[PDB]
Design a binder for this molecule. Sequence first.
Ligand SMILES: [Cl-]
Ligand SMILES: [Cl-]
Ligand SMILES: [Cl-]
Ligand SMILES: [Cl-]
Lengths: 394, 383, 385, 390
Amino acid sequence: LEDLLFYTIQEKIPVHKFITALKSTGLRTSDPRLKECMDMLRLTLQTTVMLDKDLFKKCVQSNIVLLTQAFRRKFVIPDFMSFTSHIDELYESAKKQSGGKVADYIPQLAKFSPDLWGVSVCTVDGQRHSIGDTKVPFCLQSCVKPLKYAIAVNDLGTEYVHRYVGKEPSGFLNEDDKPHNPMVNAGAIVVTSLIKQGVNNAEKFDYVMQFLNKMAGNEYVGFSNATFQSERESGDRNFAIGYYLKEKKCFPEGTDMVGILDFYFQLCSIEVTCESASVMAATLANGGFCPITGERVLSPEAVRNTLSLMHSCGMYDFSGQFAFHVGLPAKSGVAGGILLVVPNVMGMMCWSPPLDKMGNSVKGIHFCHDLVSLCNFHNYDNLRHFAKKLDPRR
Amino acid sequence: LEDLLFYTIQEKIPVHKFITALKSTGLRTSDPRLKECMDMLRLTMLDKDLFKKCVQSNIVLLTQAFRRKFVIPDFMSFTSHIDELYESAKKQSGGKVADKFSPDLWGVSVCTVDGQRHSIGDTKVPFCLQSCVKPLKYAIAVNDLGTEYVHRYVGKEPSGFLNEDDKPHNPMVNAGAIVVTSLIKQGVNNAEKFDYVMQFLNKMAGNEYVGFSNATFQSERESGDRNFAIGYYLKEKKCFPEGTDMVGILDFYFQLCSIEVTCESASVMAATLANGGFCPITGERVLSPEAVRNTLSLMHSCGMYDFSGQFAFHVGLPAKSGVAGGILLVVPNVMGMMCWSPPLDKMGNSVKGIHFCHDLVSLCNFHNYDNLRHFAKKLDPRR
Amino acid sequence: LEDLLFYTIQEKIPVHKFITALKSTGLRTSDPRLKECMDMLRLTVMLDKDLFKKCVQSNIVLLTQAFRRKFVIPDFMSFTSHIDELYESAKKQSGGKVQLAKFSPDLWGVSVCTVDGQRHSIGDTKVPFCLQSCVKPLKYAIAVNDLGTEYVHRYVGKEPSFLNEDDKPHNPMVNAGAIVVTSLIKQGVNNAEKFDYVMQFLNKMAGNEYVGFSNATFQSERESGDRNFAIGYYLKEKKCFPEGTDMVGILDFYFQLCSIEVTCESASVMAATLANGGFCPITGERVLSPEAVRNTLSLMHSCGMYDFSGQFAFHVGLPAKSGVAGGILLVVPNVMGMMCWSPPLDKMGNSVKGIHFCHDLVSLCNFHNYDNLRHFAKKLDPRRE
Amino acid sequence: LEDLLFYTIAQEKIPVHKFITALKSTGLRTSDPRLKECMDMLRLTLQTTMLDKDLFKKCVQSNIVLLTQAFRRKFVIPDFMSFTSHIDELYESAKKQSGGKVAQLAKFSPDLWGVSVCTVDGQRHSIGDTKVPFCLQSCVKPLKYAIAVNDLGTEYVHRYVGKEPSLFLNEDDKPHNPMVNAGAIVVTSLIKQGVNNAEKFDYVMQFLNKMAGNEYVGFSNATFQSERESGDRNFAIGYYLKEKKCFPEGTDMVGILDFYFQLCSIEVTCESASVMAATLANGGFCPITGERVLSPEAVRNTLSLMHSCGMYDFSGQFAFHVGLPAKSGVAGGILLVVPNVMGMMCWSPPLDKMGNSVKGIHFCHDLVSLCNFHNYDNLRHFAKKLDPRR
Ligand SMILES: [Cl-]
Ligand SMILES: [Cl-]
Ligand SMILES: [Cl-]
Ligand SMILES: [Cl-]
């Protein structure tokens, strides 16, 4: 059982040899699902480097199931080292594109260097990879749109949420007097008013944060007050939208619109890194379960709706082309993030601040094209006949 | 290998015993890939020797089959569900037939990417593809000329005659389908063009029923005012490739719309698309992966007319409707389908078709954005 | 000259006869241009060649035009009898919208003021109501008068239909355009001063007849302003205002402007000023430049009636502007201004009775902008004896 | 009256040339159809052998009314020589502006520019190339609509076509107005229904002849064959109209297009077309024949729609700045109407990026900058402008 695993890894295993093989699977020693095992190893090093069969069983037994899949290469991407080397090549290629313009409309976005570039990957199995500046905090901005949508649907269900907001691209209101979808400001503002009704903003914010925290496997989620204050002061177009929505009676009964706008600016100001965000995207890749905690964050219904709208509406005006050429659900944001989901496989956050004319981060856009150019991840690729493409699940 | 299979099924196997067990896997005794085997049986209780002699040539396929390795391992179960969904849509009596056909005609056909087949309803009655051909001829065009060339002439996304670039919005609208028609087999006459497409559709269908309705073609082309208006407009905006005869393309276009299929043959067509360009019952490579992926993308967003976005959100499967009441349905990596009932809703889609498609995804985890690990209460037919 | 007029009107004239003959021409004895004559007559009960010349001397040229039938509409009594029929005819049309309770009957009134100062009224013409959108052409004329055509039209469009190709509101007659126009006027001072200034201007337009302000309407508009705040934030976002504009304050000024009150009678003089080329008919004072008055009439023509503007231009062919209080400011260039007021509105937002009356006026008279003055077929021409 | 007139012109006897020179200075042409008997007697009188009171009476008696108004300065523009002198200056000023493109290009001669005036009293003036024939093209649009309304009335015509400024169709699934191609095709299908194109065409041609006081109206077959070849977009419209059921019952659409191209290919000069516009300014009566041609409601409707819809995409700006009903065409013509005063035709082929003749447009602005002709100018108070009626 745990003995079997011992043999696949002589009389006694040096600990470092166990750790090194574990880290090659793509797992991180700090994985919450590995905690018992790692605690035991560290404790063992104290009271003791070689592990005999009996010691190994002792350290590895609590986590044995997860550990067996790792070593039996049952993970979604079994040769991860090979895959990450491709990710790096693609990272390097995109890094040669200097074009684009960093958003200057508020001091917090403008300060960011155009030359910051990073990519983080988290598979639905919890395998992690990062290259570039992946520990630098930035604001989600519109990348928050699908997440608060997912929350709303999780709590209120499809039918209700979509009384208030549309299901498709625009190509302020559709024929039915609703904003076109959750990924446009008008739609996001309305989705924001749907969450945790009848409570003050402080608890609403906290409530939302609980969700993000879980989606991120308790990795970094933070808040930029500097950005919130600036968004709120320069927010004229969003105020125009708010008054219009109120005038057309688009909000739930009793809504305080100005309060909702404040909440909305707050939500846009939430901070992540590529690493933590990649976990959020992996939760969406994993059907609502956080890949690194095994926790159930969101209903399958919420995740399906959200991925559908990211595919359709997620890239601003580039959505149609992105869907045709990339065919992956994604959400761009003005700070230069692109939240990417390859369903059943992994999730990513790509970050470079310079934007193209559509509003999309130039290196992210270029990286996403290459990713699908290389691998058979396009939504409508086939898993049997893919031509020259590479399939990393094999 | 033929030995193992033999034991799996006493000293001798009655022929019928092997036949009914084979049928139970979803395959038909007439599968083109089973020909050698069925010929060997026609040349004769099989003892081990006669059995090995008969099945040796088809062994690999038969092995996949009897070892429950097909994309849907328990097909008899999956079939029973298709039947319930069918009987449920059958009770929906609404819609309006376009204008000769009888309402109450309803049929559904399935072909898995492994060539497993099922049918219920009026499944052998030939009807016209109409706009169902749109993705088919777009696939042919991308197959021969590639993505970059074809999309010089036509858009890649939905609308809401020409887009901001002076191209028709996509291949699934009439304007776009007319332009696409002008791209195929350029410079050759219409007669050869029609033969070429007809040959291409034969491959897609694994050589099952494909036909032409001259009656439909005649009336279509007399009533084609809106399409004529479109042709003159496209010509004037210089939308066609140099040297196009637009009045001739419209002819060809009306012809392509009049091509006939049954639910059964058209389901194989959809199966080719679900199989990455390989025909499931012939094993023949038909379209390039590039052509198939483009086609599925545009059917997903553009395929259902004004109901496209609603259909993508709820059903999440590439599909293409036509005014005869066909819906060409693709579940990638799993199966193709054709649903046929003539009565249409206000949007132009078959009423029973639409109902069936919703229920199918309500039941099974086939939605494009369903997860294959956590699906809640949905059935997964692949298990 | 005074003698000429004297004989025209025995040894002595009874003075009730001069008054009666005067009123007969359409002028009122309260006409600001007749004051001296009326004061001299107050000092004086029969008028001999001598007393008559004394009373009438000051104003003689105006009274001569009046008695010699030189006025734009020489036979006025006949023309007002027609206005009355049209009035009764439109009166009988009771459709429109303002479990509604009703404590009192419907209000309907029509006032006519000619470019010569001839006046007529029937119905409820003394009851104050808010201009609302009727104020739009008025404040646009002010802006153009003060700033000129080039400057105003950097901020707003000249054509019918939030923003057009150039990211300007379409014209001065739509809310977005009227909000921008509001921001153009008196940019130096504070809001109280801007309001006084506009109010003074409307006094000139009206020959100092009734104009006022309704605080109730103003507060009600303030509370209901979501639609107008949406527009106000959008305009700001798109940088549609002149530099240093306080947009929230401009809307407040906007609501005040919509809340200004008039009567059918005083508003008809406002319209007669626009019909008279910028000169107030009853004071002879020059209120607005010709450029401001031409620009205003042109935009009233195409843009003045909401979504009925096109149909109205084609069938009626007169510059007009309507508002939700039920008013229709009507202009007939070179002839007269009018104000029609009934509160019930049709589905397009225009006063039911007002619209009916405007149609009938042009069916009857050759006032349609594209009518011909030589060959009019069946129509009546009131400019002729 | 004949004696009164004789005295104002007179001395014991009037030299013939002196009566003629005075007549011309009023703006009337000697060839005026309404002056025919007068001129006939005059020529007859020179044969049988200086006018005395009795001889002068004999000559002008049949035409006395019109001649009396002319000499008494009762014409809409009493000082006509002063006015034409202004027209000439505006013409020269429009000339120095050579921008625009005619519908690497070679040039075999100078570009043509001409301006004709016909007053509602039949006073004439021309300067520039005013006798050169050119195709009406879209300038024919208000003319054929006026015919439709004349024969069919407002209700019938506007059951098929919109009344407002402006896809091919409005919310009623009717073309937006008579001045856009789709609307003008539908109007074309209204006229003289149930006869062959040859008969319909002769019918419009005689109508055009009356509007023009029987001055030049013609046809360009070269232009027609060309329109017929390049009409892909008009055939697109034709099939769309047909698809949407915009034509009256039983119309042959392909035949209707053919009639339409014909109507576009009709030819005028600046002079003949100025009389056409003057008919529209005169309430349906032709100024030089005194003949009733179009009904008042047809003339009103046409002027209304020219005002708002006449200049293509410049209609909005044109109405605002110029305030005159006008219609322009791809040949470089602008048919202009000052209601109650005059008609005009301006012709220069080079077009601006909107499709309007550059010289015509420039001339129209200057005309209104100078004169109080703007639809919304006041007649009593106008500022620096001059009023030619005074
Ligand atoms: Cl954003
Ligand atoms: Cl179809
Ligand atoms: Cl209003
Ligand atoms: Cl033209």
